[PDB]
Structures are given as C-alpha cells and as structure tokens.
C-alpha cells in the first residue's frame, strides 16, 4: 500500500529511498546501478524496493468518508 | 518460425481485446440481443377464452438501469456502487410493445413496463462497460474489475 | 451438394438405382441429426472449413470427418455451449500467421479478432480437433501438421499460471496450490474502503 | 428423455416419460407416418447386413398395419378407460408434444421426427454389429457448458409464461365483468421482477 | 519399468556418495529411492487405473500425436525428471496419472469409518 | 515454518479483518408501526446499561471506538407481532475490534438501512497458516 | 450526532438537528450519509 | 403439535359426522383419513404412502 | 345446469372415474358455467385447481387403480366451501342431499402427492 518504513529482515530504513529509486528507474536507468549507488547492498532491502506496488496512490480516490 | 515473443504477442492481444471473463459476457449479450425477442416470438400471441379479445406482442426493449424512488417516480438512473451500498438490485426495466386486439381491431400499439431484469456488470446493458478510467474512478467503481 | 435422406430413399425406391452406390457414400450429420449423404466426407469437410475461414460461413460452425474403417460420417456442429480453443492454421508446414502479421500486432494495427477474421487463427471444438494434428512449437512443425498452438503454457488456468516453474513440481502440489491460493490475504479491490 | 433398448431377442423397444411400458420400434414408426415396413427398413439404414436385424421388430409389429392401429396401441398405454377416439387424440397429443419436441411439436413435423428415430436405431445396430464403440460421456464432443445466457433465457421464458398466464386470467375476469380496456393497469409487472 | 529402474540406478551411481537428499533417503528420514529416481533420473510411465493413458480422441490420447500411435512417449511415459522439467504433454500425462489419489483418499476415509463402526 | 518475529513487529504480514452488521427499519402492517432506531431505556429483553455506553444518541455507534465482546452497535426496538422488544445488534462475543465505518441509507421501500463495519487487527502469531505458491 | 454527505468524497457535513423526509442532505439529493469521527482524543498504542 | 391438533380436530369432525346421521361411505372416508393421519403421526416416512407436508411444503 | 356438475362430483367421489376424465368433464362444465354464470365458473376453476394441485403426476393419474379413499376425503375437505357455494347457487333436492352434510375441515398438514419441485 505504502512503502514500509523499515526493511522487514533488517531494521534498515528504506522508505526515504522509494522516491529517488522510483523516479530514477522510471527515468530510464537500470535498477541495479540505482540500487547500488543509492545505498542498499543487501538483497533483503532490494526486494523491499524492487517489489513494491504503491497502492496508496489509487486508494486516495476510494477513501472512507469517516 | 515464431519465437516466444511473437506468440506471446498473439496471446496478449487475445487477453487485451477479449477480457478474462468473456463467456459470461458473450452469453449475456447473446441473450439480450437475440434471446429476449426469441422468447417473445416463441410465445407468439396471447389468446384468451373469449374469442373477440386478443393480444399481439410486437417488440421488447430494455432501458438504462434505474430504480423507482417513489410510487410514480421518473426512474432515475443509478450506479452499481449505489446498488451495492443501498442493497438494491442493479436491474434495468423492460418495455414490451404489445398491441391490443378488441373486437378484432388492431388499434394503436402500446409499450408497457413488464418488469426489471438484473443485468451483468461490464456488459452491453450497463453504461459502465465503456466508461473511461477517470469516469470509473469518479463514479466509484474499481477500474480493474472484469465484471 | 448434400442429398437429403428422404430424397436418397425416394431415388432408390421410386427410381431403380444401385444401393451399393449410396452405401459407399458418407453420411452427413448436423447437430446430431442425420442431414443427408455426400460423395466423400473429406472434400465436404474441407469445403466447409475453407468457407468458414474465408468469412463466407459463420465462425461458429465446426465440421469433422470420422472415416472409421467400418463407418464414415461428417459431423457439423453449430450449437451453443461447445468449449473451443484457438489454433494457428498451418498450411504446407508453414503457419498462416507471418512476420508481417506479428509486426502489425506489435505496432497495434491489427488485433486477435482481426487475425481470426482473416482466417489465420481458428477456434476449433473437440469434434473438429479429432482430425486435427497439432504441433507445440514451430520447430516441431511438419507438412503433415494441420495446426499450431498459440501458447504452449495456455493449457493452464488462472491459478495454475500463478506457479513459477510448475513443471518441476508434482501434480498434487500444483493442485493444492490452486486450492489454497484462493484463501490468501491481499487487496481484493482498490475501493474496499467504500464497499461494504 | 427417450430411451431406446435392444432386448435379448433382436426386438427394439422405444420408451419415454409419459408413456408407461416399452413401445415397439415399428409400431411407433408407423404411428409417426410410415405405412409399410420397407420405408422403415430403408429409413434405418441402407446396408442389408444391418437392415436384417429389424425383422423381429417388424413382425412384432406385424399386426399393426395402419397408422391408427399404432395410434390406439399407444393410446391404450397413455390413458386407459376412454373411448377409441379419445385414445387416438391423447396418443396424438403425447406423440406430438412429448416425443421429440426439439424437432417440432406440430403434426406436420411428425414425419421428420420419425426419420430421426430411425437414425437413432441405426446407431444401436452399429453398436451391436461391432462397428462402433460406445460413446464417451467424458468426451467434450458430447458435453456442453451452459453459461448465464442459456440459463437466464430459460428463466425469462418461465417468468414470461407465468406473467402471460396471470395476464390472461385478469383480462378474462375484467372482460366477463366489464372494466377498463387499457392494459396499463393490468400489467402486474412484479410477477417477473421478483421471480427472476 | 526396466528402463525406469535402470535410469534410477544410473542416477544414483553418478550421484554424490553423501548428499542431504541422499542422507534423508537412506536413513529413512522422509525419502525413498523412487523419489530420488523421479527427481533426478526420470519420471517414468504414468498409468491411470493401472494402465497407460488411453482417454482422449479416437486412437489418440492427445491431439498432439499421430493417429493410432502406440509409441511410449504418446501414452503417458515421461522421460524427463523434475529437475530437468516436464514437456507440456508430459505434464498433462503426469497430472492425469496423479488425479486418482485426490478422490481415492476421500472415498477410503468413509469406507474405513463405516467398516470400523461395524 | 519459523517466522522472524522482528519482521512481524515491522509489519511483515499484519492484516485487518472487516465485519459488517446491517439492519433495516422494516415497517409491517399496522397503525404507523415501525422499528425505530433509538437507544433503549427500560423495555423488555434489556441487555444491561453497561452494554449501551458507546451507543450514540441517534442509536448507532460512532466510528473509531473500541468494541469489546457483546457491545451493541445499533439500538433497535421492535413492536410485538402478536411492549417493545430488543432486536438490537450485539457484537459477536469472540470478536473484538474497532468500529471502522457507519453508513445510513434509505431502502427502495422506504425503510432506514444502517450498516456498521468493524475492523480487527491481526498480527501473525503461532498457529497462523501460511502457504507458498507451490502447495507448501 | 453530526453526519457527512457521501457525494464525491466527504461532501460537507450534516447535523441531526436538520429534519428532512427520509435521509437526505439539504445540499444535494444523494441518499447516502455517514457518521463522522467523534471529536475525542483516541489513545492508539503502537503495539 | 401440528400433527396432533390435526388428528384431534379431524377426530372431532368424525364424531360430528357419526352423531349427525351421515351416510356410511363419507364416514368410512373420514375414518380412512383419520387412520392415515395417525399412521403419519407415527413414522411419517413410510413407503407406499405420501408423507404429510407443512404449508411451506417441507415434509 | 348445476345438476350435471353435482352428478359429476358424485361420480368422481365414487371413484368410478379417474383424474384426467374428471378434469376434462369439469373443464367442459366450467365452459358451460362461464356461459351461464362467471361465479360458478370461478368456483369450478378453484375446484379443479385444488384437484390438480393434489392430483398432479399421481402414481395412477387416471389409471385403472382406484384413488385412495383418504385422498378423496382430504380433497373434498379442501373444496368443501366451494362445493357448498356451488350448491347454494342452484339447489337440487337429490344432488344436494349428499353435499348437505360435508363440511370444511382445516388441516395444518396435507397429503399432497405433488411437491414444490414438481
Ligand atoms: Zn534489509
Ligand atoms: Zn450533499
């Protein structure tokens, strides 16, 4: 839905790296180099950044009135 | 010699033009376009015990989905989300144009409301089938549901 | 050119004709009802198939020719409910779909419906597939082959295509995966908050 | 459902739901419009070897020479205790509307239905002679899948039949009593709306 | 059957003397020789109700094969192990072979319960 | 299987379960007889004054409140079919959660329809069932 | 007992003191209303 | 309870027929109906006899 | 002529005639009544509706086997108010003598040969 604050395996913050990684990958750069120079070398964090859906962008339209 | 990508192009085109649930939509569209009038025609005519009186069934038609808010309301149209929230039935009215025969005279044809039929989602009957993504978001429907 | 059964019986009875002349003929059935007789089943089946492919006949008609040594018949089906699958038509060992068609598909000029209308890909039922000879891959294609598969891994369903490398598992494992993948938790709809 | 059986003796017995007991093959053929055994034999098939198995059935129906003998033989089973004319009429309605209605319920189509029946008998003989194996109930050439269309149109058919029944009742009551001629107030639409 | 047994023996001989899967199999810790053969050498003949795969079109178990073909590959014989991966028709035949247990267990439970109650 | 509890504490497989309780203020033949939705004071079948603590004035519980055990969510009183009786909704005894959403509508026939959706947070624990994409 | 008109997302607000036939908001004819979050502080422990 | 009240009231009807000088055959028919109601009260599902059904049609 | 319909009911009650025969005779007499009086026609329609509801798809269905006595008694119980109304419509000394004593009996449970399914 929204990117987790910390990697599930190791308590490393990956939430702040979502915007740069996503913006640069969408810009036309291979995810490997972007991840390597962003500061995530353990593949436990890479699977956190690589396999994310960002459902929260769609949900804000369908929000409970409450 | 079609490689993997060439054949996957055909498969992706199949899944793109034809939805995941196509058998239901195809059967319901066949029913609405043909079988609705076919049932009326196989019925043929309404004949009563009295000889002079007769009824001929001319044509059948379905309107856009709507509900009767009041006793004699104008049948305002609704969205499937409203039907879900208010426990309504997403159904459309049926008008059958039957002409009355009294003393063996045809008279003038009249179409009457014979009932509401539930319609399949994302079919020819409902308007949400051809709506754009933004309109689907605005009405309150998930853009990805196959119906 | 199908001669009606009553016409055949009349022209054997009313007119003196050879019964063995019509014994070697091929019976022609339509939707399980004996429709008539024909000279040879293969020619009529090919005529019906070509008429359907050219667009003259409807695409819902499926024709098959049995040609058992004891009995030969032609079965024509046009009723609803038949589960039919699309196959690429292969003529003389080369599929009808070509490089230009694939380029148009990739560009988006034509779609799958345009392919089936053009006669390149046809939907066949079990009865018609009885006399079809299919190849999994273009490298397996021979002049004897009649059809080709659009997607070799399309024999699976929606859930059996979820599994990665499913051919390395045992079949009960894949069946149980299909059974228990419907129970998994996740986002069932983007508008789950307004829905009740 | 119509069931055709071959007993230990080569006689063939045809039965269906409303008629108790088993009707002989040649009797029901003569009731449908066939006049002499030659037409029945040639309608079943054209091969003498397979035609020779109908003789015991024909001579079991040898006493039945005309169509009316077959008709009242059936009518004895259909309903017993009424006059011969009533028996003939009852047999006529049950044969027309309860035998093979997919071919047609009108008396004009009756002859056609007879031909169909003969073809069915042919298959049994082809099964008995050893020419063909029994049909597979699992083969998809024999299995059809009904989606929402066929079911939902059957449901609309029954709902419309009930609606027309109620409309006829109300219209006849209004006519014998004397009321408004307009159909708008006699619609009673919910008969469909709720039913579906 | 002899071919499958020979292939299993060859795979076991060429296999490492002491593997984790081998340790599991030989010690009796959730393993068997047939499992080793099917995971390494080849699946073997897949039989439904004790006989080769016969159901399908006339004289064909599948539309991929020629009319009246009695070759081993045609009627439910898989020459590919699970490590190598199964061909589409091989996977179909494996599924057809394994279909039976899913219902045999269910019927067996009720029959055994009834007999034990008696 | 063994699962890392630190991952669970970081939201590895935390989930939410939503349950819906809905009623219709149905009108049945009589003189202006309706099952008005209102908090209950002294009528028969009364559950107890403690169970109506969180029920709002209009008779339906306000969103974002803790619901424990058999708390009432919608207060409904029904006249007898053959003198008020309690048909008010009691939250399931086992289920505990927070009220997520409250919805009020008018049905086609003109009866008041009220829906209350209650959410419950499920953190993975010992005994929870997990499965891979292969049948394990 | 404040409410909210369900048209679009969180369309304005309603008060129970407003009296209309059936259930409607005065602003629009939409038939669906929702109860708002009560103006009280809620303690939510972060597990 | 429903079967019992049916039996009781039908027995009352049979008594009224007996005391009113009714024809013999209608008395025998009512007697047969009473015996059927009793034989349904015990072992409703008996072969050769239609089970009594409630107003909703359930057995 | 209500004499014919009452004699028809007497004949049906004696069991000499089956269900389709009595249905046909009541249909003809209902046509006659609709010609004469619509109220008699609707009474006969109710009587045949009750008879068909009970005697639909019966094991005999007009066969030589007689109708069981309890079925006849029960159906004549259910149609008793309509029979009394028909007798009140036209009074016949000989015919109404047998129907003067038959009364309506309300039953919670009914022996309907036909069910909801058919
Ligand atoms: Zn990490
Ligand atoms: Zn508003």
From Swiss-Prot, chain E:
It is found in: Cytoplasm. Signal peptide: none annotated. It comes from the Archaea. DNA-dependent RNA polymerase (RNAP) catalyzes the transcription of DNA into RNA using the four ribonucleoside triphosphates as substrates. Forms the clamp head domain. Corresponds to about the first two-thirds of the bacterial beta' subunit. Part of the 13-subunit RNA polymerase complex. Interacts with TFS4. Belongs to the RNA polymerase beta' chain family. This is DNA-directed RNA polymerase subunit Rpo1N. It comes from Sulfolobus acidocaldarius (strain ATCC 33909 / DSM 639 / JCM 8929 / NBRC 15157 / NCIMB 11770).
UniProtKB/Swiss-Prot annotation, chain F:
It is found in: Cytoplasm. DNA-dependent RNA polymerase (RNAP) catalyzes the transcription of DNA into RNA using the four ribonucleoside triphosphates as substrates. This subunit is involved in DNA promoter recognition. Belongs to the RNA polymerase beta chain family. Part of the 13-subunit RNA polymerase complex. Interacts with TFS4. This is DNA-directed RNA polymerase subunit Rpo2.
Swiss-Prot record, chain G:
It catalyses: RNA(n) + a ribonucleoside 5'-triphosphate = RNA(n+1) + diphosphate. Signal peptide: none annotated. The keyword Repressor does not apply. It is an enzyme of class 2 (transferase). Binds 1 zinc ion. Its cofactor is Zn(2+). Zn(2+) binds at residues 5, 8, 25, 28. It is found in: Cytoplasm. Its EC number is 2.7.7.6. GO terms for cellular component: cytoplasm; DNA-directed RNA polymerase complex. GO terms for biological process: DNA-templated transcription. GO terms for molecular function: DNA binding; DNA-directed RNA polymerase activity; zinc ion binding. Its main location: cytoplasm. Keywords: Cytoplasm, DNA-directed RNA polymerase, Metal-binding, Nucleotidyltransferase, Transcription, Transferase, Zinc. DNA-dependent RNA polymerase (RNAP) catalyzes the transcription of DNA into RNA using the four ribonucleoside triphosphates as substrates. Belongs to the archaeal Rpo12/eukaryotic RPC10 RNA polymerase subunit family. Part of the 13-subunit RNA polymerase. This is DNA-directed RNA polymerase subunit Rpo12. It comes from Sulfolobus acidocaldarius (strain ATCC 33909 / DSM 639 / JCM 8929 / NBRC 15157 / NCIMB 11770).
UniProtKB/Swiss-Prot annotation, chain I:
The keyword RNA-binding does not apply. It comes from the Viruses. Residues 101-114 are annotated as: C-terminal tail, binds in the RNAP DNA-binding channel. The keyword Aminoacyl-tRNA synthetase does not apply. Induction: Not detected in early stages of infection (in Acidianus convivator), strongly up-regulated at 72 hours post infection (at protein level). Keywords: Eukaryotic host gene expression shutoff by virus, Eukaryotic host transcription shutoff by virus, Host gene expression shutoff by virus, Host-virus interaction, Inhibition of eukaryotic host transcription initiation by virus, Virion. One of its GO terms (biological process) is symbiont-mediated suppression of host transcription. It is found in: Virion. GO terms for cellular component: virion component. Belongs to the viral ORF131/RIP family. The C-terminal tail binds inside the RNAP DNA-binding channel, locking the clamp into a fixed conformation (in S.acidocaldarius). Plays a role in the inhibition of global transcription by interacting with the RNA polymerase (RNAP) clamp, locking it in a fixed position and inhibiting the formation and/or stability of the pre-initiation complex (PIC). Also overlaps with the transcription factor B binding site; overall RIP probably interferes with DNA loading onto RNAP but does not displace DNA once it is loaded. May play a role in virus particle assembly, possibly by dissociating active RNAP from the virus genome. This is RNAP inhibitory protein. It comes from Acidianus two-tailed virus. The lineage of its organism: Viruses, Viruses incertae sedis, Bicaudaviridae, Bicaudavirus. The chain holds residues 10 to 127 of 145 of the full protein.
